[PDB]
Amino acid sequence: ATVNQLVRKPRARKVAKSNVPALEACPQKRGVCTRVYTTTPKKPNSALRKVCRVRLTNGFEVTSYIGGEGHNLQEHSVILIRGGRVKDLPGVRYHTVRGALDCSGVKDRKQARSKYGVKRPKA
Amino acid sequence: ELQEKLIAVNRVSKTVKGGRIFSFTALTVVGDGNGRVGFGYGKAREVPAAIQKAMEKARRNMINVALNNGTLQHPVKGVHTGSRVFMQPASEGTGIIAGGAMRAVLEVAGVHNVLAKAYGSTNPINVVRATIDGLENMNSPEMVAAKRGKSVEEIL
Amino acid sequence: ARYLGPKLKLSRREGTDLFLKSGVRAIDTKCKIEQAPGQHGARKPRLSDYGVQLREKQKVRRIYGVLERQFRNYYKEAARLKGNTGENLLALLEGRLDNVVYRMGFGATRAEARQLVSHKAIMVNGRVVNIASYQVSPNDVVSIREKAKKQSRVKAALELAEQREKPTWLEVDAGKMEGTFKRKPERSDLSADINEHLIVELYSK
Amino acid sequence: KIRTLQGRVVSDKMEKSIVVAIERFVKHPIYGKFIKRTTKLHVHDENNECGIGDVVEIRECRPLSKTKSWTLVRVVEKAV
Amino acid sequence: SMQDPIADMLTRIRNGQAANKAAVTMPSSKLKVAIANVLKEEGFIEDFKVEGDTKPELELTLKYFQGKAVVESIQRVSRPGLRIYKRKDELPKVMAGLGIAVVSTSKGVMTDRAARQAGLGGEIICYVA
Amino acid sequence: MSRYQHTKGQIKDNAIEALLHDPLFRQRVEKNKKGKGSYMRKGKHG
Amino acid sequence: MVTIRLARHGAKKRPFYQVVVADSRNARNGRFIERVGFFNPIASEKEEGTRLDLDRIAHWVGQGATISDRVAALIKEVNKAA
RNA sequence: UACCCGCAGAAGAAGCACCGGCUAACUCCGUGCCAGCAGCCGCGGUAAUACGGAGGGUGCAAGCGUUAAUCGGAAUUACUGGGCGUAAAGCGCACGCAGGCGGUUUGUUAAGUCAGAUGUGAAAUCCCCGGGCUCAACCUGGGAACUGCAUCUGAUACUGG
RNA sequence: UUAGCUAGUAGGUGGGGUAACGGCUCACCUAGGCGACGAUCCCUAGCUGGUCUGAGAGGAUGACCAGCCACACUGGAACU
Ligand SMILES: [Mg+2]
Ligand SMILES: [Mg+2]
Ligand SMILES: [Mg+2]
Ligand SMILES: [Mg+2]
Ligand SMILES: [Mg+2]
Ligand SMILES: [Mg+2]
Ligand SMILES: [Mg+2]
Ligand SMILES: [Mg+2]
Ligand SMILES: [Mg+2]
Ligand SMILES: [Mg+2]
Ligand SMILES: [Mg+2]
Ligand SMILES: [Mg+2]
Ligand SMILES: [Mg+2]
Ligand SMILES: [Mg+2]
Ligand SMILES: [Mg+2]
Ligand SMILES: [Mg+2]
Ligand SMILES: [Mg+2]
Ligand SMILES: [Mg+2]
Ligand SMILES: [Mg+2]
Ligand SMILES: [Mg+2]
Ligand SMILES: [Mg+2]
Ligand SMILES: [Mg+2]
Ligand SMILES: [Mg+2]
Ligand SMILES: [Mg+2]
Ligand SMILES: [Mg+2]
Ligand SMILES: [Mg+2]
C-alpha cells in the first residue's frame, strides 16, 4: 500500500485460469465418443442427463453434455464440443454441438432450431 | 409542480411466534426540478400505503441545492454508510450519466447533465442519502465569494 | 435493411402518431392507436427505466426509418461533433435526403420519399442523388427531376404537405418542385415530444 | 563543451581502470516517487590517480576494452 | 519524528476550524509564513502574526462565516514521502476554480491561478477549498 | 437409449438391489408450498 | 542509388501516388527518405492533382538523385503550369 | 469497366435470436422432478409467462445466434483509487546495517523542479478543419498530437548537494 | 520453492587480426569482473510504430499495413 512498498514489490494482477482448458482457446474441438451415458444431477434436481466422455483431437479426455431431446451418438462417434458447463452435473464443462459431424440435429424442433442444428422446415 | 418518483420498494419481515410478518418499505424521492430535493422512506403492511407514507415524508424535509444552468457547480463527493458517491458537472447535452437510485434523485432535483459514479455499496437508501448529502454540501461561486470576503469576479 | 411490416402497429406500440401514413385519413379511424399491438394490448405494464429509454429510441428510429447500426453510427457522429449531442443527432436525422424530401412535400410519407430517392427522382444541386441516408447540406437545392415531375403521387404529396405545418428551415416551390435546404434545423423547430436525452443516455450504457 | 558524468569510485583494483557508480535520480513511471537508481561504469584512468570512494568526472569514448568505454577527465573530493 | 511542517500546520488549521478556535499557533518557518500570507490574500484566514526572535511562533486567526468554518477542506498534495511537481499546463483546478492550490514556483509561493498567469509550474504544496 | 452409469462399480450379487442403493433411486421429497420448508424469498415470478 | 519516384497509395481503381525520395533498393511503398510531393491521376476538376515541393526535389537532384520518368513528366507539367 | 440511357413488370429477393427476474417482449395446449432448460439465481413432482408446440409480442436484420478470446463493468491488486479491533489482513517483542523520510537560519550551488528555445520523436494510424469517389465505408491535403529523450539559455520558492 | 556466477573470466603490456574500436585473438603480468537496483539458472517470447479496450490512469495485444531483427530441409564452413 505504501508507495515505497509498491515500488519494492508491485501489485499482482489476479491470474484467472480458464474453465474450458481442453478447448485450448479454440472455439470448438473435435473428439471421439469414448463412452456415452446418463447420470443423475446433483441436488436439488432430478433427471437422467445424457452425457458423453470424449477423447479430443488435442489429447484431452473430457466429458461433454448432449442437449436436446434424443441423440444418435454412441461409441466411436466423431463430434464437435464447444464449451459451456452444465451446472448440475459434476464435472461437465462442455456441450456437444448438435448438427456438426456425427451428431444429429434434434428431431421436430421448431424454435431455437439453430441451437439444435435443425434446418428450416420448408412449406 | 413537485415531481415525485419511487426508487425502490422492498419486502421486509419480522418473525413472531405464529410465523413471519411481512411488510413493505418504499423509498421515494421528490423534487421541484430546480434546487429542491427530498427523499422519503415509508413502511406499511401493504405497498401502496407504504409508498404514500414515503411520499409524505419526502415532501417535508426537502433540501435546496445550488444548481448552475441545470447541472452541478463542481465535482463533489458524498458518502453515507457504505455508499460513497462521486458526481461531476458535465456539458449541456451529456444527459444524466448516473446509476440506480442516484439517477432518480438527480432527475427530480433538476440536474440534467451529470457524470456520476457510485463507489462502495450501492444500497439504494444509503446511496440516495449520499447523493443528497453531496448535493447539499456543494457550494456555488457566489456563496464562496461571500464566505471568503471577495467579489465573484475575483474568484472566477 | 428496411422495415417492410405493418406501419400502424409500430405507432400503436410507441403510443403516438409517427406519421407513417399520409394523413388523408386520421390515425384513430385506421387503428386502435391507444391500444398496443397484439393479444395483450389492453394490459399496460409499468415500464422500467431501461425500457422507457429504449422505447424513446425506437420511436425516433421508427419515425425516420433508420435501422440500428446506422442509428448508432449517427449517434457516435453526433457525440464527436461539437455542441449538444441529442440536438446534433436530431439535426443529422433531419439532414437525411429522404427526410428532407418528405419535409418539402414530395412524399406523402417518409417511406414514399425514400422510395422516390431510390428510384432516381430527386436531384441535389442538379445531380441525381439516389441514397436516402445522403446528408443534405445548407444552401443545397433539392428537386424533382423532369422525368418524375409528371407523377400524380408527387402532386398529391405536395397537397398533403400544404395541409400540414410548413418547416421554417426549408423554402419550397410547388410549381418548380425544387426546395432549398436553407439551414440545419434548430431544436425549437423540431418536435418537443421527442426526449433525445433519453436516447443519449441509452447509448451510454 | 562535452557531455560528462560524475560518480563515486566503487573500486580501483584493476590496473589503469576504476568502476564508477553514477547515481541518477529518476521519477517512477506509475507511482511518481523519485528513486535513486545506480549506473556502475568501468572507466579508464591512466596513471591510477583515483582512490576508492573518490568523486570523479568522466566522459564517454571509443572502447578501450570489453567493458571499458568511458575515460575520466578530472578527480574531485579525494578525501579519506 | 516531525517529518512535514507544512502538513502539520495544515492539520492544525483544520483542527482549529473543526473545534471553532479563534486562532491557531505554531512554530514559525519561512515557507509556512509564505503559505499563511497566500491564504490571507485568498481570504481563507483573517490575519497571521509571527512573534518571537529565538524561536518565533506563527499565529493564524481563523475565519468563520455564518457560524461555520471558511476552510472547508485543506489537503497537502506534495509531501516528503512523495513529491508532486506540475508544469504550467498541468496545474490543478481545485473545486472547479473556486478553491485554490498553493504552489511553490521559481518566483515564490503563490496560488495556482497566479502561477498560471505568470506562466510557470512548480511544487504543489496543498489544495484549499 | 443410453446406459445409466451407476456408482456401484462391479455389481456381483444382485443388480436391482444395487440400483436401489444408488442415487438414481434416491428418495425425493418435495418442497412444501405451505408449511415447513415453505418460505420462499422470491417468487417464481418475483 | 537514391531516386525520386511515385509510391502507390490509394484504393483499387483509384490510385494516389505519393512522390518520395528513397534509396532505390527499398520497395515501392516501403522505406523512404523524404516525401517531396504528391500526384493524383484521378483528380477531379477544381482540385490540384499534382503538387511537388520543387525546392526539395532540386536539392535531392543536386545531391545525386535520379528521377522517375513519370516524376520528371510531372515536374515538367508543374513548370509549364506556373 | 465505372457511369449514363432505354425495356418490361411488383415483378427475382427475410431471416435469426429472444419473451421468470437481471432484460425489451404473454398467453393457450402438451408433459408431470420425466422429458428437458440454464449465464447467474433457478425451473419442471397435473392449472409451468422458465421444458416442448402453437398463437401473439420484443430485439436485431442479409444477417442473427452459440462458442472461444481480450478489456470493461471489477475502487475485486485501489498510481489516479481499497484496506487490516470484531468481516481476509499488525511480525510475539526489540535492536539495528542497507534503504525511505528529515527541525530551523543564512550563504552558495543549480542535481531534482520550473520556463523558453534548438534537434529529434519515420510514414501510416488516432484526433481537428478541409477535399475526392452519387452517400458512406474508403481514399486523401494541411494541421494538431506523438505526454518522450538530448542539448543550450534562463528562474531559484520548494527538495538535494 | 533459481543466490551465488565467471579463468579469456576482469583489467594491463606487447605482438597478431579487422574496413573499423575492442580478449576479436595469442603470449606474459596483475586478480580481478558481475550479483539482492536480482547476477546465474529455469520457463515463455521475434521487437517497434501501432491494435483492442478504458473517462483516464492503466490492462491486454503485436493478424493486415510500415520500420528493425532473425531464419531459408537439419548441423557446420567458408568462397565470390
Ligand atoms: Mg414476546
Ligand atoms: Mg448492413
Ligand atoms: Mg457532442
Ligand atoms: Mg428468461
Ligand atoms: Mg420485462
Ligand atoms: Mg430457451
Ligand atoms: Mg400446463
Ligand atoms: Mg418456452
Ligand atoms: Mg481495475
Ligand atoms: Mg476492501
Ligand atoms: Mg473469527
Ligand atoms: Mg480476523
Ligand atoms: Mg502486537
Ligand atoms: Mg528541511
Ligand atoms: Mg537544472
Ligand atoms: Mg525543459
Ligand atoms: Mg508519425
Ligand atoms: Mg464529400
Ligand atoms: Mg536550494
Ligand atoms: Mg538548501
Ligand atoms: Mg592490443
Ligand atoms: Mg597492433
Ligand atoms: Mg518462439
Ligand atoms: Mg475503469
Ligand atoms: Mg519445410
Ligand atoms: Mg544449412
Distance G64 CA to H111 C1' (A): 48
Rg of chain F in Å (alpha carbons): 18
Tell me the C-alpha distance between E58 and E76, whole Å.
19
Q: Which residue of D has its CA nearest to A5?
A: D31
Tell me the C-alpha distance between E39 and E24, whole Å.
14
How many domains, in total, are found in chain A?
Answer: 1
Domain around E17: 5-69
Closest CA to C127 of C150, C97, C158, C99: C97
Tell me the C-alpha distance between B143 and E65, whole Å.
10
Tell me the C-alpha distance between A87 and C131, whole Å.
51
Q: Name which of A7, A11, A13 to mutate to probe chain D: the one with the most chain D Cβ atoms within 10 A of its Cβ.
A: A7
Q: Which residues pair with A95 in a beta bridge?
A: A65
The upper half-sphere exposure of residue C152, i.e. CA atoms within 13 Å in the direction of its Cβ, equals 0
Q: Is G36 left (phi over 0), alpha (psi -120 to 50) or beta?
A: alpha
Residues C89 and C100 in one domain: no
CATH number of the domain encompassing residue A102: 2.40.50.140
What is the residue whose three cell numbers read 450504457? C205
CA G22 to chain centre: 11
Residues B18 and B78 in one domain: no
Residues E79 and E112 in one domain: yes
Residues B47 and B68 in one domain: no
DSSP C132: T
Residues E93 and E44 in one domain: no
Non-local CB neighbours of D36 within 8 Å, separated by 6+ positions? D23, D24, D25
| Bond prior to E80 in cis (omega within 30° of 0) | no
DSSP of B88-123: EE--TTS-EE--THHHHHHHHHT--BEEEEEES---
How many domains, in total, are found in chain G?
Answer: 1
Q: Which residue of F has its CA nearest to A44?
A: F28
CATH number of the domain encompassing residue E39: 3.30.1370.30
Residues E57 and E97 in one domain: no
User: Considering only CB atoms, which residues of chain B are within 8 Å of chain C?
Assistant: 92-97, 103, 112
Closest CA to C122 of C144, C141, C95, C105: C144
Tell me the C-alpha distance between D32 and E73, whole Å.
24
Instruction: State the greatest distance between any 2 C-alpha atoms of chain D, in Å, as a whole number.
Output: 45
The count of other CB atoms within 10 Å of the CB of residue E29 is 15
How many domains, in total, are found in chain B?
Answer: 2
Which of B63, B91, B106 is the endpoint of a domain?
B63
Domain around C128: 94-180
Non-local CB neighbours of D52 within 8 Å, separated by 6+ positions? D9, D10, D11, D12
Alpha-helical segments (H) within chain B? 47-59, 101-109, 124-137, 141-148, 152-155
Method: cryo-EM
Ligand 17 center to G33 CA (angstroms): 14
Answer whether any strand I atom is within 7 A of the Cβ of D3: no
How many domains, in total, are found in chain E?
Answer: 2
What is the residue whose three cell numbers read 425425493? F28
Is there a contact between E98 and B155 if contact means CB atoms under 8 Å apart? yes
Is there a contact between C201 and B93 if contact means CB atoms under 8 Å apart? no
Tell me the C-alpha distance between D31 and A3, whole Å.
7
Q: Which residues of E touch D32 (CB under 8 A)?
A: 82-84
Task: Measure CA to C1' and name the residue nearest H83.
Answer: A1
Is there a contact between D33 and E82 if contact means CB atoms under 8 Å apart? yes
What is the residue whose three cell numbers read 447509448? C203
Domain around G19: 1-81
CATH number of the domain encompassing residue C24: 1.10.1050.10
Ligand nearest to the CA of A13: 9
Q: Which residue of D has its CA nearest to A1?
A: D31
What is the residue whose three cell numbers read 443528497? B132
CATH number of the domain encompassing residue C160: 3.10.290.10
Distance D69 CA to I39 C1' (A): 21
Answer whether any strand I atom is within 7 A of the Cβ of G31: yes
Non-local CB neighbours of B63 within 8 Å, separated by 6+ positions? B36, B37, B38, B132, B135, B136
Domain around B48: 3-63
